[PDB]
Amino acid sequence: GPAVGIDLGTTYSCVGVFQHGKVEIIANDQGNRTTPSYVAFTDTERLIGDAAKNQVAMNPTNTVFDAKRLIGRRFDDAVVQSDMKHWPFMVVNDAGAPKVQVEYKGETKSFYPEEVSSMVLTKMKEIAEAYLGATVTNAVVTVPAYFNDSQRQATKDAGTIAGLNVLRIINEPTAAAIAYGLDKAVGAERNVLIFSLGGGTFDVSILTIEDGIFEVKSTAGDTHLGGEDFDNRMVNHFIAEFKRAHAKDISENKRAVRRLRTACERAKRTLSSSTQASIEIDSLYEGIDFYTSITRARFEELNADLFRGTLDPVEKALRDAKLDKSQIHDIVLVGGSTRIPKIQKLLQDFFNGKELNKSINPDEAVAYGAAVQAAILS
Ligand SMILES: Nc1ncnc2c1ncn2[C@@H]1O[C@H](COP(=O)(O)OP(=O)(O)O)[C@@H](O)[C@H]1O
Ligand SMILES: [Cl-]
Ligand SMILES: [Cl-]
Numbered sequence: 622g623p624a625v626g627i628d629l630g631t632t633y634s635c636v637g638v639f640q641h642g643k644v645e646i647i648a649n650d651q652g653n654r655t656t657p658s659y660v661a662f663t664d665t666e667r668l669i670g671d672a673a674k675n676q677v678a679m680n681p682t683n684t685v686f687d688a689k690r691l692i693g694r695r696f697d698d699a700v701v702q703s704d705m706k707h708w709p710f711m712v713v714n715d716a717g718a719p720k721v722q723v724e725y726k727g728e729t730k731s732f733y734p735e736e737v738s739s740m741v742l743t744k745m746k747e748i749a750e751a752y753l754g755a756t757v758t759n760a761v762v763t764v765p766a767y768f769n770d771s772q773r774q775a776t777k778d779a780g781t782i783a784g785l786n787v788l789r790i791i792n793e794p795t796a797a798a799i800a801y802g803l804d805k806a807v808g809a810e811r812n813v814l815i816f817s818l819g820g821g822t823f824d825v826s827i828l829t830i831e832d833g834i835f836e837v838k839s840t841a842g843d844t845h846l847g848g849e850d851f852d853n854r855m856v857n858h859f860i861a862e863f864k865r866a867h868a869k870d871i872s873e874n875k876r877a878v879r880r881l882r883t884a885c886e887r888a889k890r891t892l893s894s895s896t897q898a899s900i901e902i903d904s905l906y907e908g909i910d911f912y913t914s915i916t917r918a919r920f921e922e923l924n925a926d927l928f929r930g931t932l933d934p935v936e937k938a939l940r941d942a943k944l945d946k947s948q949i950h951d952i953v954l955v956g957g958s959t960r961i962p963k964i965q966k967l968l969q970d971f972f973n974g975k976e977l978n979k980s981i982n983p984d985e986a987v988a989y990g991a992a993v994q995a996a997i998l999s
């Protein structure tokens with residue numbers, strides 16, 4: 622085509638294309654290499670990606686995200702019923718299937734999870750098209766290893782609706798291993814551990830690879846642990862700080878909280894490269910600016926338990942795979958959160974100093990591998 626590889630993420634999506642033996646992780650119209658898996662509806666327009674997430678704080682009811690948590694599931698599914706209680710948007714039941722309901726151009730409308738995700742894939746498709754200067758048709762789209770047939774089918778349908786011919790649906794951990802060339806035959810079988818920590822979910826997958834054939838040995842994790850949870854710890858920290866300094870609680874002002882959450886997410890990323898970060902918010906509450914800062918140490922302490930807890934699923938995955946730490950040949954980092962120095966330290970210490978595969982941006986590794994496989998299938 623060339624064909625492309627797309628990581629349809631829980632919170633961010635990424636598209637890459639393999640040309641001249643190299644993978645190109647494609648930047649969007651705003652120059653970002655990953656795009657929010659968001660879609661918004663207003664009185665006049667449908668927004669997608671950066672444009673949608675950039676207005677989430679002011680239009681919470683009609684800004685959709687987490688469609689991946691609904692995709693391929695039934696309305697009465699326990700997880701679906703549990704998640705709805707936390708989303709600002711409506712999820713309704715249509716013949717037993719979940720649909721998000723929103724207001725668009727003054728009218729009420731509902732979309733299936735695959736329709737919402739097709740909008741995200743369309744955005745990724747156009748992003749690739751703007752870079753290639755050519756129409757993009759074929760693509761490989763990834764999914765978590767634990768996805769069932771219905772979830773895989775619905776993800777594929779999201780692609781078809783986007784005008785893409787889905788060459789294949791492959792597992793995210795497998796895509797990651799392919800990015801590092803771990804799929805090449807080298808004689809005996811090799812055990813690869815994929816440590817994936819994104820913005821909303823945590824997954825540990827152990828794969829055994831032999832003759833280019835992957836075998837998911839075990840999967841562990843927490844579908845409700847991700848970078849967004851680390852931002853929450855920071856948010857509460859600063860809400861307390863603002864109350865101390867100004868004797869005012871901003872907790873009930875949904876927008877002040879989102880602007881603070883956005884500032885924390887940005888500071889967090891900085892703390893992965895530097896030891897301190899400055900928070901500066903103009904007019905956060907009742908015209909009061911919030912200028913402060915936070916140290917990496919402070920950040921690590923606010924999340925110490927959450928970070929350390931990532932090691933339990935690692936132990937359990939090993940146990941279920943019937944392998945000992947020492948039998949793992951490669952450890953691959955996936956997800957933007959794995960860029961956090963403390964998490965790398967924890968994982969490495971657990972593996973007694975073993976080096977981590979982390980040269981490819983973790984939040985891009987899945988798209989990277991998908992792009993490689995998409996080319997191979999073309
Ligand atoms: N440099 C960084 N340091 C810490 N966290 C990061 C960094 N870059 C991205 N992240 C985080 O990774 C998370 C999710 O991004 P990925 O790109 O992993 O998305 P998804 O949630 O769909 O897997 C977010 O919480 C984001 O804040
Ligand atoms: Cl864009
Ligand atoms: Cl430590």
Ligand SMILES: [K+]
Binds near residue numbers: 630631632
């Ligand atoms: K992603």
Ligand SMILES: [Mg+2]
Binds near residue numbers: 630631817819956
């Ligand atoms: Mg991910």
